[PDB]
CSV table of C-alpha atoms in Angstrom, one decimal:
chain,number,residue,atom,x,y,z
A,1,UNK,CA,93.9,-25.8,36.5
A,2,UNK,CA,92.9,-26.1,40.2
A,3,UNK,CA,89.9,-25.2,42.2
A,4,UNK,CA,88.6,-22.3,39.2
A,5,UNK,CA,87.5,-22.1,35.9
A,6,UNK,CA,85.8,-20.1,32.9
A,7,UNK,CA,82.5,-22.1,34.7
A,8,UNK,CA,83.0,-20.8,38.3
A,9,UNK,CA,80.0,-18.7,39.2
A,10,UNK,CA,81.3,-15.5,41.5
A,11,UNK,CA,79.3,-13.2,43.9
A,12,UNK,CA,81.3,-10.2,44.5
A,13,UNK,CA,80.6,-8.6,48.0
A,14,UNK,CA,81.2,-5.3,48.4
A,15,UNK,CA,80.5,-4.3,45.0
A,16,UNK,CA,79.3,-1.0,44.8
A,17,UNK,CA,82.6,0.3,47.0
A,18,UNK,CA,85.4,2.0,44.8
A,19,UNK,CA,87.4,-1.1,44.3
A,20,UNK,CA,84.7,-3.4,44.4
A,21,UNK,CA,83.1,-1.6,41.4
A,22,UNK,CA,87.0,-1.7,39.2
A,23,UNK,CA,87.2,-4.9,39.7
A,24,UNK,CA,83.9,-6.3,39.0
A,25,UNK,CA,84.8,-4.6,35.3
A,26,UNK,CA,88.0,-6.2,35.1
A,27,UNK,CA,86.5,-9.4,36.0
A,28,UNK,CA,83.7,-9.2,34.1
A,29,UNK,CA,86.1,-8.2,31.1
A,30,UNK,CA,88.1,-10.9,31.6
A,31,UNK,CA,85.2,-13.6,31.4
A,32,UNK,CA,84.6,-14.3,35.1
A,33,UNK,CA,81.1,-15.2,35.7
A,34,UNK,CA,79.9,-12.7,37.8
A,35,UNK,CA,76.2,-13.9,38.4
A,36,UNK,CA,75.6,-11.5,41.7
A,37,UNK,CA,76.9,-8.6,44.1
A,38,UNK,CA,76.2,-7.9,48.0
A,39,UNK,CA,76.4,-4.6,50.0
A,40,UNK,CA,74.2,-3.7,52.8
A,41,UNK,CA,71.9,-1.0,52.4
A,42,UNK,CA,72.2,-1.3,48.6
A,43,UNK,CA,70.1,-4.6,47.7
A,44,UNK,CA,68.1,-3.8,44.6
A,45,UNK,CA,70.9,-1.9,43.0
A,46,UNK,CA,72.8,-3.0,40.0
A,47,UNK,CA,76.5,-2.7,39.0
A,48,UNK,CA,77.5,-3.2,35.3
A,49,UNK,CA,74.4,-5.8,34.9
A,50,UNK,CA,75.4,-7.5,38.0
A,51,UNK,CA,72.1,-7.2,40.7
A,52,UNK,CA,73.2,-6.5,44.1
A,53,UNK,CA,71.6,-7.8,47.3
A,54,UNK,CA,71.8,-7.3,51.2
A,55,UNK,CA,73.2,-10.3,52.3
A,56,UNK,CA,74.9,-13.5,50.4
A,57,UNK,CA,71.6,-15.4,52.0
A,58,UNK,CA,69.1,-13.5,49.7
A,59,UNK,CA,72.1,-13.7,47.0
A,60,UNK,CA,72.3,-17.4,46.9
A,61,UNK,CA,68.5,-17.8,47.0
A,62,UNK,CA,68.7,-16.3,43.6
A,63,UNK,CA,72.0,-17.5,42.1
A,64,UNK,CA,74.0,-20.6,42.1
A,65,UNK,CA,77.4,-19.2,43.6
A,66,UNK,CA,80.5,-21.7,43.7
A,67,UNK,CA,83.3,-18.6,44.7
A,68,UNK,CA,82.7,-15.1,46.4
A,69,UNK,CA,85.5,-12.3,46.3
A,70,UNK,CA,85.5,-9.6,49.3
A,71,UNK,CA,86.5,-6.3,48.7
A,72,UNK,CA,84.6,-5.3,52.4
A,73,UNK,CA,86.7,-2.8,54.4
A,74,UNK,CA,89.0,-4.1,56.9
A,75,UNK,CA,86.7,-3.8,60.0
A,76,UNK,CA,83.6,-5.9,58.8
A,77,UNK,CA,85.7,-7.8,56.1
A,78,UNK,CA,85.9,-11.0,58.1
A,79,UNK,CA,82.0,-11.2,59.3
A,80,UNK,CA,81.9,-10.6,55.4
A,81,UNK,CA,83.7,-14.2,55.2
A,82,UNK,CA,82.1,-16.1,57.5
A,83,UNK,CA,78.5,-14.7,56.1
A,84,UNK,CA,80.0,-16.3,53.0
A,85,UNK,CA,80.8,-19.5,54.7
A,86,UNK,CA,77.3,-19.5,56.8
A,87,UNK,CA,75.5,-19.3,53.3
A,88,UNK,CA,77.3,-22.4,51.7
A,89,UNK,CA,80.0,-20.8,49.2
A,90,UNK,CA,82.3,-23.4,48.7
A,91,UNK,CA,85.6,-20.9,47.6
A,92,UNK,CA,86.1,-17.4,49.5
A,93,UNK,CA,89.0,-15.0,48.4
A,94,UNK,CA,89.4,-12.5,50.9
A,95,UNK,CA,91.3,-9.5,49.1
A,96,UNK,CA,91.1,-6.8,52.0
A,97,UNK,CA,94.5,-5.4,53.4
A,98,UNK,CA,94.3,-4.3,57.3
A,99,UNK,CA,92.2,-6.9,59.0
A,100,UNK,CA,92.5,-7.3,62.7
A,101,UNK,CA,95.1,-10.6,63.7
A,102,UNK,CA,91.8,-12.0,65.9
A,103,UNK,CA,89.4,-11.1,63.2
A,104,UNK,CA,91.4,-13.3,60.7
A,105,UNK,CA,92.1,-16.1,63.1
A,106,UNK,CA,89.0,-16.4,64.4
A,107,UNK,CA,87.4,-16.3,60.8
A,108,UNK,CA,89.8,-19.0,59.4
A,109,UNK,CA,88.7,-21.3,62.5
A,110,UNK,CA,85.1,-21.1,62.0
A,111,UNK,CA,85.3,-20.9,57.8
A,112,UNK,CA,87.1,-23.9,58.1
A,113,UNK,CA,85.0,-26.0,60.2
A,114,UNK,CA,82.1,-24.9,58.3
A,115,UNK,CA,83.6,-26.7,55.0
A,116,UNK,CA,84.3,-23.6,53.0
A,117,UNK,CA,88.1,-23.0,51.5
A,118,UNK,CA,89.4,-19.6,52.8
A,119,UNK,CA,91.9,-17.7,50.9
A,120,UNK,CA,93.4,-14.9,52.4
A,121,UNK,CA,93.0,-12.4,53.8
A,122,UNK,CA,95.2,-9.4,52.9
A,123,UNK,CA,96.0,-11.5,49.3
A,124,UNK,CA,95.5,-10.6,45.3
A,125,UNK,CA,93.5,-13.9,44.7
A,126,UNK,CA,93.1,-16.6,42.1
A,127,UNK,CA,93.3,-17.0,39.0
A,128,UNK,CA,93.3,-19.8,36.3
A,129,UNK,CA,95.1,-18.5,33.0
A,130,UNK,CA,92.9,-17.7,29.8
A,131,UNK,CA,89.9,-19.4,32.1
A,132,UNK,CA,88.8,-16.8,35.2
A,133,UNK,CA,89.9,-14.3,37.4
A,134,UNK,CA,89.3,-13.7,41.3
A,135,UNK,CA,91.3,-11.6,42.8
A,136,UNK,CA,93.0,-8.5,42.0
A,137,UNK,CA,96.5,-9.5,40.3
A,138,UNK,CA,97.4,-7.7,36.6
A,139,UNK,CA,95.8,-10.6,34.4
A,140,UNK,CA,97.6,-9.6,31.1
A,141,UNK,CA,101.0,-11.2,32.4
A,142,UNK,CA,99.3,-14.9,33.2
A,143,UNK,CA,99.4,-16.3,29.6
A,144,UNK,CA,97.8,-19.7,29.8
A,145,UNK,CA,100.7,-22.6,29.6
A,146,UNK,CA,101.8,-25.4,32.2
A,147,UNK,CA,103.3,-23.6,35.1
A,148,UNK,CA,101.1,-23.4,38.9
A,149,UNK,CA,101.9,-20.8,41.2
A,150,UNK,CA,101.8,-20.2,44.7
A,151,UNK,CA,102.8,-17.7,46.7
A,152,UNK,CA,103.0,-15.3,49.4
A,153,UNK,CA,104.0,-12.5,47.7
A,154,UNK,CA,102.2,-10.6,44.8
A,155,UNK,CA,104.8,-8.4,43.5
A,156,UNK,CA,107.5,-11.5,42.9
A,157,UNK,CA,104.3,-13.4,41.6
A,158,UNK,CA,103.5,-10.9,38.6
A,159,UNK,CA,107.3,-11.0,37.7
A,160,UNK,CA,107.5,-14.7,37.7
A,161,UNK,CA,104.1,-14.9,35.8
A,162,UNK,CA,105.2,-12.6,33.2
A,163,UNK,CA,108.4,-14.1,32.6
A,164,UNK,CA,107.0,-17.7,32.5
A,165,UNK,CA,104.9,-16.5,29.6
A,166,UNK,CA,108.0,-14.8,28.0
A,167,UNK,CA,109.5,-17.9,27.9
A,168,UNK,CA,106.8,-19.8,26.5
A,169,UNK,CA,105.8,-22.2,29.9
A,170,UNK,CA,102.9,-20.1,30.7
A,171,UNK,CA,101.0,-20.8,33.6
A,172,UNK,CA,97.7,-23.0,34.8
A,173,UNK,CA,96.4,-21.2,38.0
A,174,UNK,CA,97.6,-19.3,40.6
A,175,UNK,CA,97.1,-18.6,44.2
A,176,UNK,CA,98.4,-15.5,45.5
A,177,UNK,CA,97.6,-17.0,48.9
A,178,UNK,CA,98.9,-14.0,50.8
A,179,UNK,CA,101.9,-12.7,53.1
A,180,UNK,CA,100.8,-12.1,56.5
A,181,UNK,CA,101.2,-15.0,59.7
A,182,UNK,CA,97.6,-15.6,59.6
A,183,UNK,CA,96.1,-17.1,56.3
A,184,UNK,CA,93.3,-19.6,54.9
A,185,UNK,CA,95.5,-21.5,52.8
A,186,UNK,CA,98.4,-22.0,52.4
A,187,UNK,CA,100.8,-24.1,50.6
A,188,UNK,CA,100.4,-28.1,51.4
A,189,UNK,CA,96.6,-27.1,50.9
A,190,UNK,CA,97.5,-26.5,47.7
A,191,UNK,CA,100.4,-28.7,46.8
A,192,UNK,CA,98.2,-31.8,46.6
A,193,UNK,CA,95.9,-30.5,43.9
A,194,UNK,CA,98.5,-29.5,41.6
A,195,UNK,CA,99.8,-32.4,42.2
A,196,UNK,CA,96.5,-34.2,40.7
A,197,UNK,CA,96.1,-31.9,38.2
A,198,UNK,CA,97.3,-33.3,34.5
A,199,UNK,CA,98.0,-29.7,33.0
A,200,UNK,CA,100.0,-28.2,35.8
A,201,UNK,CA,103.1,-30.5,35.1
A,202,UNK,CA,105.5,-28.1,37.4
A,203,UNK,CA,104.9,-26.3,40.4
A,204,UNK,CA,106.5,-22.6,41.4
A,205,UNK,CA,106.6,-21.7,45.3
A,206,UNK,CA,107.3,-18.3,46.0
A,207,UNK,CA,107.5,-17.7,50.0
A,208,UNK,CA,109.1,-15.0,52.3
A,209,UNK,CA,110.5,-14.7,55.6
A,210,UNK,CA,108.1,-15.7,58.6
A,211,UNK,CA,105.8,-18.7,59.8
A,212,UNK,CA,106.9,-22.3,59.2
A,213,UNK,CA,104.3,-22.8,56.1
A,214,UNK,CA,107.6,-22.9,53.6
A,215,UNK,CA,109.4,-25.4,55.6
A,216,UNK,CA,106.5,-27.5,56.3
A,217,UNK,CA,105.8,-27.6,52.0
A,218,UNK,CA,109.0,-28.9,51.7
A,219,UNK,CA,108.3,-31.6,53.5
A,220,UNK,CA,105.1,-32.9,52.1
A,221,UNK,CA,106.9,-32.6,48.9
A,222,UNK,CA,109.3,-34.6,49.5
A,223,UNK,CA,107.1,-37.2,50.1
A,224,UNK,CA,104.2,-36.8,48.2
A,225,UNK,CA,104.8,-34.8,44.6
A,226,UNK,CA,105.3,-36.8,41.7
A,227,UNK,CA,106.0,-33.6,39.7
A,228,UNK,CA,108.5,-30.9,39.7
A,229,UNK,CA,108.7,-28.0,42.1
A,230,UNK,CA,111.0,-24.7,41.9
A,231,UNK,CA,111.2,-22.4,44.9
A,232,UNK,CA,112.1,-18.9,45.3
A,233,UNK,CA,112.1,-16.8,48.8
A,234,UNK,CA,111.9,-13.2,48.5
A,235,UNK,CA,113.7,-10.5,50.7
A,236,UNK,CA,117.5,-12.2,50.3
A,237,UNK,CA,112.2,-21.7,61.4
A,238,UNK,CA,110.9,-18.1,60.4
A,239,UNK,CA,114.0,-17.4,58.7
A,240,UNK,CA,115.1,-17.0,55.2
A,241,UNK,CA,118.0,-19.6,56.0
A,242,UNK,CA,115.6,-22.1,57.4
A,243,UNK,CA,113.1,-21.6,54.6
A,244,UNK,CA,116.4,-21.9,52.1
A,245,UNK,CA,117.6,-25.0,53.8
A,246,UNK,CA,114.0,-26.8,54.0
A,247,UNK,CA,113.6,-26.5,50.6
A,248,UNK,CA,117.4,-27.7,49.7
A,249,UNK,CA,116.9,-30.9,52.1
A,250,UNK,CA,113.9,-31.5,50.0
A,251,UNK,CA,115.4,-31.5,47.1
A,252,UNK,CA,113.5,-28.2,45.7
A,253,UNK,CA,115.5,-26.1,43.6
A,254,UNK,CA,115.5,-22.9,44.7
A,255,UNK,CA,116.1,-19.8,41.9
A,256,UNK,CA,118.3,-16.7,43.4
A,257,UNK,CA,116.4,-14.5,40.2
A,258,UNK,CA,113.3,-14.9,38.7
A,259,UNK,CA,115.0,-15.5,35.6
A,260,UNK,CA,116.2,-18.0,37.3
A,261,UNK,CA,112.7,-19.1,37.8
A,262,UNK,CA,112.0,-19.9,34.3
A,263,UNK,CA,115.5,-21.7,33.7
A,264,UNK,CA,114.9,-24.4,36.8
A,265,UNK,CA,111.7,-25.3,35.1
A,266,UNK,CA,112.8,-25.5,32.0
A,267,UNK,CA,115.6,-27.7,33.6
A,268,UNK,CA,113.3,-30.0,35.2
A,269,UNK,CA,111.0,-31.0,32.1
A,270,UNK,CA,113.8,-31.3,29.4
């Protein structure tokens, strides 16, 4: 696994909100360590067990927090990030659809600088099979195996999950890192911890059309991974060909299926 685990502590902000409050209960049901919530105006409340507070400062003054989830809407949801960032959590998944180009730009400057990891916005979030879940992503289909996952795309990553644990592979974590030009993290941020990690023994990249983050993967693993790595674009620099052809010069197999998915790893490890 990379980055999470059964251990991670989560603050959830934006906890008592409609999606905040579903979500906390899958979480919670899934064994996600949920040790605290925020929501202005409702400090002093509590959602299933979990106490909620004002602001991640009085939060963290209370509870050891190593990942927050925001479920904030869209127009405060990246002051929401950077009050994460301000108060020290390390890990910040972003789920919130709709946030404002500038908003997200200016938030992934500042988070970065500070020292905190950024993922999203506009994303379903991590998760580390059979271990915890941060996000939003359907966690019966992510059976605990050897496969990681990145991608850009939520819809092609719950079939490839699913269908990875059909066949047995399973999975170690994933990062639905999100779709839109302007993310936290992408996937060379990724890429290199895979890479380190002893259970993940392949790697699945699952991009789309837009940006140059595909092309630029391809690259760094061509150079750096010492492990194998399958690719898949969905909607068949910026283009689907260039993204296709990156990936081929590399030497990344790239599945035209998802069942396709399953059979190129199952290729690579023998």
């Amino acid at each position: 696994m990379i980055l999470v685990n059964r251990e991670t502590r989560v603050l959830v902000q934006g906890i008592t909100g409609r999606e905040g409050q579903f979500h906390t209960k899958q979480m919670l049901t899934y064994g996600t360590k949920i040790v605290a919530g925020v929501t202005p105006g409702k400090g002093g409340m509590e959602v299933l067990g979990v106490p909620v507070y004002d602001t991640v400062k009085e939060a963290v003054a209370h509870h050891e927090v190593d990942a927050s989830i925001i479920f904030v809407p869209a127009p405060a949801a990246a002051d929401a990030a950077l009050e994460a960032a301000h108060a020290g959590i390390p890990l910040i998944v972003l789920i919130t659809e709709g946030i404002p180009t500038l908003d997200m730009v200016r938030a992934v400057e500042e988070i970065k600088a500070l020292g905190s990891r950024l993922i999203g916005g506009n994303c379903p979030g991590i998760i580390s099979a059979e271990e915890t879940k941060i996000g939003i992503m359907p966690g019966h289909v992510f059976k605990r195996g050897r496969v990681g996952i990145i991608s850009r795309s939520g819809t092609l990553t719950y079939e490839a999950a699913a269908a990875l644990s059909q066949a047995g592979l399973g999975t170690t974590t994933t990062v639905g890192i999100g779709g839109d030009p302007v993310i936290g993290t992408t996937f060379k941020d990724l890429l290199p911890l895979f890479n380190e990690d002893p259970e993940t023994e392949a790697v699945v990249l699952i991009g789309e059309i837009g940006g140059s983050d595909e092309e630029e993967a391809a690259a760094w693993v061509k150079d750096h991974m010492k492990k194998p790595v399958v690719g898949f674009i969905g909607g068949r620099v910026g283009t689907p060909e260039s993204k296709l052809r990156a990936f081929a010069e590399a030497g990344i197999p790239v599945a035209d299926t998802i069942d396709e998915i399953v059979e190129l790893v199952k290729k690579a490890l023998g």
